[PDB]
Write a protein that binds this ligand. Structure first.
Ligand SMILES: *[C@@H]1O[C@H](CO)[C@@H](O)[C@H](O)[C@H]1NC(C)=O
Length: 270
């Protein structure tokens, strides 16, 4: 099927386990130069063309410096990625959802500014969210409230009641940390997964024998979580069905049946 959003080589496991084939630059977004979020860190490919836009939120008392992995790893596979700082360290999930929307609106603005390093670099119609803990809840609430979004990746989601997510229509991949002692997977992440309609493309992958920061910088799951996140963004932000096997096929089965993973659920195939 013709796909104008397809970029980069045919994917193989080893390639998706490391920084991608797009050379990237990063720049700081000053809190003072934006409204509706606390600024953050911008990653973009230096090669020409338009790329999907992704906004990533930290959790409670979290800063963008703790998620630079996701900025670099996603951008280097061919996305424009803004890891936000929030207005306050203490912003709740609903607030983080509004800030993720403003962050994506910010990218759409900068796309039309001749001065911006991402001038003419953003496909403003192809937007996704992701986040850690209350940022994960926030990404899923932003997906609920903005059903034009292409993908959400909540990671170790925290407080928000599962009942909030019974109408989510955005393709959602959730990461769990099996021994999360802040947001226990069986009471926080898995009920959220289960609440999403079975008509929505979804996936849950849980990291074995690890706690709440297993998805964050220094978490020690770059190869697996990076591969799954790149693959989910590629599949849904870019409509790139070459990535299906990494979320539903042979390469997914090898990962979820490995010693690194304690659970997976999905409504594959897709
Ligand atoms: C949910 O969707 C999946 C994939 O389409 C399907 O295989 C499965 O049987 C569905 N579950 C229920 C309860 O219908």
């Amino acid at each position: 099927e013709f796909n104008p959003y397809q970029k980069g080589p045919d994917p193989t496991a080893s390639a998706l386990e490391r920084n991608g084939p797009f050379a990237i630059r990063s720049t700081s977004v000053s809190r003072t130069s934006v409204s509706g979020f606390g600024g953050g860190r911008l990653y973009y490919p230096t090669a020409s063309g338009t790329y999907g836009a992704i906004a990533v939120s930290p959790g409670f008392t979290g800063t963008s410096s703790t998620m630079t992995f996701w900025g670099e790893r996603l951008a280097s596979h061919g996305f424009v990625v803004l890891v936000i700082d929030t207005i306050t360290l203490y912003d709740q999930p609903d607030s983080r959802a509004r800030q993720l929307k403003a962050a994506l609106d910010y990218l759409a603005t900068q796309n039309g500014r001749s001065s911006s390093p991402i001038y003419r670099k953003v496909d403003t119609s192809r937007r996704a969210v992701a986040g850690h803990a209350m940022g994960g809840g926030g990404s899923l609430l932003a997906a609920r409230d903005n059903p034009s979004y292409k993908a959400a990746i909540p990671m170790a989601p925290w407080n928000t009641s599962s009942t909030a997510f019974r109408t989510v229509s955005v393709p959602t991949m959730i990461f769990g940390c099996q021994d999360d002692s802040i947001a226990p997977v069986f009471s926080s992440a898995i009920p959220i997964y289960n609440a999403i309609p079975n008509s929505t493309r979804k996936n849950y992958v849980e990291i074995r024998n690890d706690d709440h920061f297993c998805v964050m910088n220094g978490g020690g799951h770059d190869a697996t979580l990076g591969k799954l996140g790149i693959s989910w963004m590629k599949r849904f932000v870019d409509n790139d069905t070459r990535y299906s096997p990494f979320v539903c096929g042979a390469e997914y089965n090898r990962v979820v049946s490995s010693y690194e993973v304690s659970r997976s659920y999905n409504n594959c195939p897709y």
